[PDB]
Write a protein that binds this ligand. Structure first.
Ligand SMILES: Nc1nc2c(ncn2[C@@H]2O[C@H](COP(=O)(O)OP(=O)(O)OP(=O)(O)O)[C@@H](O)[C@H]2O)c(=O)[nH]1
Ligand SMILES: [Mg+2]
Ligand SMILES: [Mg+2]
Ligand SMILES: [Zn+2]
Lengths: 121, 148, 48, 240, 50, 49, 65, 13, 35, 134, 181
RNA sequence: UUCGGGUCUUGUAAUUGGAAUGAGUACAAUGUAAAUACCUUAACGAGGAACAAUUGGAGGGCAAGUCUGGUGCCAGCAGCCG
């Protein structure tokens, strides 16, 4: 019913933020809604993470539309302060995108979170 | 319009990079008969041959042949109906089984073919990326399977 | 295969004499088979 | 490549309702049912014919799996002019608009979608195309829109769901004609990532046989997609 | 040296007598590792001619 | 031997492109059409008998 | 700098001594000579250098210890 | 083709 | 394409391309020399 | 029955029967009596020493003909004369009359090849890696 | 005399080395993982064959059998620790599903390439043999070194390496000295 | 098998850069009964990186060359030799 949906629980939020930090270290993370949008256009997004506390929430509501058209999983986390910190940057992040790579060192970890997000949707 | 079937994307030249454990095996009618003659259990015999779980499969054509064989081969029919053996439907008029198996491996490069028929084995050998299982000696033998 | 690489050395073909330069390229066997074959084609058709 | 003011030669494809634009590069093209505008930002080709200005749209094989089917050389397509088509998985007008172009004014497309956000764009696009009936409903429960759909010539399924075989079976038993066409786009990862694509493609073909659907041809969609295939079958309700 | 190999080839073609190798000036080596390597290489090359 | 097998493998990747279509990341940039052309009368689908 | 640590110390009055394993951290240095180790061990244990004996030192692969 | 044929002559023979 | 570069025919645009003209001139001369 | 005893106490008869019958195989008979090397090419050895008598093909016209590569050899163990093959006509220069040759298994009827001459490999001589000592 | 020291062969030649499918599989493997020869592939296949034969024998035994429990648990724990077997697949049935690529992905060469310290598997091999890589505090110069789950996040450039914070190698300082001169 | 067919960044016998490292040499220490070596490590030590991997196998091509036969120009054998 609320615009930011589905919102991950506390346990899933930590598991999501774990993968975001690893992808940051391996150069497999795109930070910001603008960069996230380009990944969807190129079809190189493994899934999308959004911040539910964005002010206003509407500036990132184009992303779920692009995802559902492209059949890309997406999920909302409660805090952009926490999302940006785990992204490795010094500022809040409202949206991030895990880039597709079947030759990545964190492939198993990424697919584990992706499977749970599909269950959430 | 002319038709040239595409090469399967599961093939790296002569190597089938799709067939990985657990395996799916298409059983031929005579494979069951030679299996009984050598006292080789189908599920255990395949698990010993490949060191992996094998998912044996019997098509309608093969099941029809086993039934037409008669009372002499009663044992083979009962073994064919073991619940661990799954069944594949056929949508072609003929009950000839050798052509049925050859068409399936042409369509999908994911099956091992288990057969002792001399004619069928040459036909399968020409199709690239198709491992060929058979019972010889005391146990099963597999030819074109690099993972072994 | 008991051959050495020296045994398989390239033998180089000679060219027309300078004094004979005005007469043109010095024909060799591979050249001759082309005009020998071409002539036979004309004579066979011309006979028919 | 195919820049703005370039000139091309438009000739028909082997398939009715489908065209090829020649040049230094070749393009797959369908005639625009709603001329003057693009649905998803594709290039358009204008031809002056006796003089009225007819328009054409470029069909991108990287955006549409059906177009990837045309490029790869499918033998039979039941989507043709003057046919009713049930399109399952119509996220928006990206590929339904091209299917609407092929069937033409005389045919119709029943575009079924579930999610509401893509459904809004599907409804908006359908207003420009009178031959599209947008049905924002779950394809797992065809009973919910039986009033809205009649008997149909072809069923096209792009639902990227693990239980897509059931959905295609349920919709065909109600709405598809005997000897009708079925065209499924299969994505191996969605159904079973644990096994290889070839195992998935074989399994889906077995489920179709179980549902009185006779497969006719199978095609894999490289270089446009990875681990994707299109299976074309015929609905033989009498017997296989 | 060249004249060592020259004698051996003269000997090989006129009837090989008993040939016994004597290595001298081995005190000039400063390392034991290099001394052993020289002896091994020297011995095995001698083993081709004899 | 390592260098020899590296050159053998990269050579085989080139030849694989001449045996079948291979996915190479998809679309990059604006879509510019089929560069080698479209053949109207040729089908590559595997047909069930 | 060079660090010296002693571990597994056994007081052995049967032989009138203390026995132990010696770890030497010597970053950016080839190794530490037995003489200088004896001097430092004599310093830390408050014994004459003649009463200290060190042996069996193996540098770790990669160096530095 | 000419090079090919000369090799078919070998496998035939 | 810029408006001035656009031409009614496909060929007239191809003449405009300077790189194409240079290649055709070079390739044409070589064939005539061989001929 | 199958013509053999089957009783639980007939092990002696089964054993004694097998020992008597095992002598029927020629392989068993040759193996036990040590006569398996009578049919050997060299009477039990892998190589044979020989003396080069004369070169049968040295006067043939066509180069590298099968006859040109033949040599007559006298085996030193028993003195019987045989024919051996040399790898090529070039290797024929290293072979000369009255030289010791080592033969190994290989114009039908010629069934040996020369592998060493004067204690040196012919292939080593052919590759110019050794000199034949005289 | 002194007691014998044990030794064993770590590989075995395959049944039919000349099958075309086998040669193509070996080509793809050696190319994708940067292997030197077929003997490395044979070594890994030998280990995997031993493991899967052990799992087969244990699966033949009755569930709750003491030997089955003990040895199957040991094997599963080892495979999970080395990273080949996932934490969610702790059963002998998934032990029978393992493949050579699962073991090849755990080699230090592959890990060094994947973590981004090298631009290819061959650059990774060169970096490892040239003493540039450390697992924790230890320089490892063995490409076939098998990385554990805990060891994965500790792969780095060694303190002594010019890429790890030390002074430049001979080439760099030779060039700098000549440029200064 | 002829009929031909399929497909697209491929080829170069082209130029060019400065980074890495140990075989080896070697202060030294370590090691050892004393040594040698290994493991450490100053200083040296790579572009034909001549700091010069091997061992078997398959198949060509060439001359004002040589030998043999024969329904002309071919065929066979062969070719370190013109
Ligand atoms: N250091 C060292 N000097 C040696 C050795 N053998 C010979 N010498 C020296 O080398 C010099 C030559 O020794 P000679 O005995 O005369 O050798 P040579 O072969 O007779 O020399 P020529 O007759 O002049 O051709 C002498 O000063 C020897 O002391 C050796 O093993 N070590
Ligand atoms: Mg030797
Ligand atoms: Mg160092
Ligand atoms: Zn059938």
């Amino acid at each position: 019913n609320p615009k930011a949906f589905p919102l991950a629980d506390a346990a899933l939020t930590q598991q999501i933020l774990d993968v975001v930090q690893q992808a940051a270290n391996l150069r497999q993370l795109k930070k910001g809604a603008n960069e996230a949008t380009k990944t969807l256009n190129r079809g190189i997004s493994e899934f999308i993470i959004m911040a539910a506390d964005c002010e206003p929430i509407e500036i990132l509501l184009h992303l779920p539309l692009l995802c559902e058209d492209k059949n890309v999983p997406y999920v909302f986390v409660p805090s952009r302060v926490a999302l940006g910190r785990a992204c490795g940057v010094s500022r809040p992040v409202i949206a991030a995108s895990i880039t597709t790579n079947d030759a990545s060192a964190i492939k198993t970890q990424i697919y584990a979170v992706k499977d749970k997000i599909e269950t959430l949707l | 319009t002319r038709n040239i079937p595409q090469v399967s994307s599961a093939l790296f030249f002569q190597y089938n990079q799709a067939i990985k454990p657990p395996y799916q095996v298409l059983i031929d009618t005579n494979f069951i008969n030679f299996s009984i003659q050598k006292k080789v259990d189908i599920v255990r015999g395949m698990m010993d041959c490949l060191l992996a779980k094998c998912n044996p499969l019997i098509t309608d054509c093969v099941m029809a042949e086993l039934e037409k064989l008669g009372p002499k081969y009663r044992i083979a029919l009962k073994l064919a109906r073991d619940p661990r053996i799954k069944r594949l439907s056929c949508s072609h008029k003929g009950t000839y089984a050798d052509d049925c198996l050859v068409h399936r491996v042409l369509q999908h490069k994911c099956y091992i073919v288990a057969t002792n028929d001399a004619g069928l084995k040459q036909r399968i050998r020409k199709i690239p990326g198709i491992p060929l299982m058979s019972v010889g000696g005391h146990a099963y033998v597999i030819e074109k399977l690099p993972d072994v | 295969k008991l051959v050495h690489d020296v045994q398989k050395k390239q033998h180089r073909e000679r060219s027309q004499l300078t004094s004979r330069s005005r007469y043109g390229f010095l024909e060799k066997h591979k050249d001759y088979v082309k005009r020998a074959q071409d002539f036979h084609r004309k004579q066979s058709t011309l006979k028919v | 490549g195919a820049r703005g003011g370039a000139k091309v030669v438009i000739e028909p494809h082997r398939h009715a309702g489908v065209y090829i634009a020649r040049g230094k590069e070749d393009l797959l093209v369908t005639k625009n049912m709603a001329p003057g505008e693009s649905v998803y930002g594709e290039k358009r080709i204008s031809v002056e014919e006796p003089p009225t200005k007819v328009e054409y749209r470029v069909w991108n094989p990287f955006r549409s799996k059906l177009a990837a089917g045309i490029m790869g050389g499918l033998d039979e397509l039941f989507i043709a002019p003057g046919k009713k088509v049930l399109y399952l998985g119509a996220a928006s007008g990206t590929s339904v608009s091209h299917v609407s172009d092929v069937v033409g004014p005389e045919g119709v497309v029943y575009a079924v979608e579930f999610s509401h956000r893509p459904g809004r764009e599907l409804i908006s696009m359908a207003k420009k195309r009178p031959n599209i009936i947008p049905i924002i409903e779950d394809a797992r429960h065809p009973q919910k829109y039986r009033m809205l759909i009649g008997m149909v010539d072809c069923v096209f399924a792009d639902v990227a769901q693990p239980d897509q075989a059931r959905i295609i079976a349920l919709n065909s038993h109600m709405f598809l004609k005997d000897q009708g066409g079925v065209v499924i786009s299969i994505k191996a990862n969605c159904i079973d990532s644990t096994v290889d694509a070839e195992t998935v493609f074989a399994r889906e073909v077995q489920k179709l046989r179980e549902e009185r659907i006779k497969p006719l041809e199978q095609l894999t969609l490289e270089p446009y997609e990875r681990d994707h295939c299109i299976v074309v079958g015929r609905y033989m309700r009498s017997g296989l | 040296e060249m004249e060592t190999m020259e004698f051996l080839n003269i000997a090989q073609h006129h009837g090989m007598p008993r040939v016994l190798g004597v290595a001298t000036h081995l005190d000039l080596f400063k390392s034991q590792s290099t001394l052993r390597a020289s002896k091994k290489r020297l011995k095995h090359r001698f083993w081709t001619e004899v | 031997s390592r260098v020899k097998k590296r050159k053998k493998y990269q050579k085989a990747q080139k030849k694989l492109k001449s045996v079948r279509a291979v996915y190479s990341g998809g679309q990059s940039g604006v879509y510019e059409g089929e560069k080698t052309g479209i053949k109207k009368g040729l089908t590559r689908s595997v047909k069930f008998k | 700098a060079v660090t010296i640590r002693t571990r597994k110390v056994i007081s052995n009055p049967l032989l009138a001594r203390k026995q132990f394993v010696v770890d030497v951290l010597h970053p950016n240095r080839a190794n530490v000579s037995k003489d200088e180790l004896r001097e430092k061990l004599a310093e830390v244990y408050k014994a004459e250098k003649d009463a200290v004996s060190v042996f069996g030192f193996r540098t770790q692969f990669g160096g530095g210890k | 083709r000419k090079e090919r044929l000369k090799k078919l002559a070998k496998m035939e023979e | 394409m810029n408006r001035k570069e656009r031409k009614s025919t496909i060929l007239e645009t191809l003449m405009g391309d300077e790189a194409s003209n240079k290649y055709f001139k070079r390739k044409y001369n070589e064939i005539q020399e061989k001929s | 029955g199958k013509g053999k005893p089957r009783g639980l106490n007939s092990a002696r008869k089964l054993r004694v029967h097998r020992r008597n019958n095992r002598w029927a195989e020629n392989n068993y008979k040759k193996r036990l009596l040590g006569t398996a090397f009578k049919s050997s090419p060299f009477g039990g050895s892998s190589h044979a020493k020989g003396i080069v008598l004369e070169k049968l093909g040295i006067e043939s016209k066509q180069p590298n003909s099968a006859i040109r590569k033949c040599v007559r050899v006298q085996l030193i163990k028993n003195g019987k004369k045989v024919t051996a093959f040399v790898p090529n006509d070039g290797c024929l220069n290293f072979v000369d009359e009255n030289d010791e040759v080592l033969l190994a298994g290989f114009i039908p009827g010629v069934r040996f090849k020369v592998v060493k001459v004067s204690g040196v490999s012919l292939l080593a001589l052919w590759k110019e890696k050794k000199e034949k000592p005289r | 005399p002194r007691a014998p020291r044990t030794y064993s062969k770590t590989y075995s030649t395959p049944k039919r080395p000349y099958e075309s499918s086998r040669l193509d599989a070996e080509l793809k493997l050696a190319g994708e993982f940067g292997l030197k020869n077929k003997k490395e592939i044979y070594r890994i296949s030998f280990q995997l064959s031993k493991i899967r034969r052990a799992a087969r024998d244990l699966l033949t035994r009755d569930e709750k059998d003491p030997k089955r429990l003990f040895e199957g648990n040991a094997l599963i724990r080892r495979l999970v620790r080395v990273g080949v077997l996932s934490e969610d697949k702790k059963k002998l049935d998934y032990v029978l599903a393992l493949k050579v690529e699962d073991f090849l992905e755990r080699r230090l060469q592959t890990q060094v390439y994947k973590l981004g310290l090298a631009k290819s598997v061959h650059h990774a091999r060169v970096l490892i043999t040239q003493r540039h890589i450390a697992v924790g505090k230890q320089i490892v110069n063995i490409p076939s070194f098998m990385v554990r789950l805990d060891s994965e996040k500790h792969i780095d450039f060694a303190p002594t390496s010019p890429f790890g914070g030390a002074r430049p190698g001979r080439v760099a300082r030779r060039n700098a000295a000549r440029k200064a001169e």
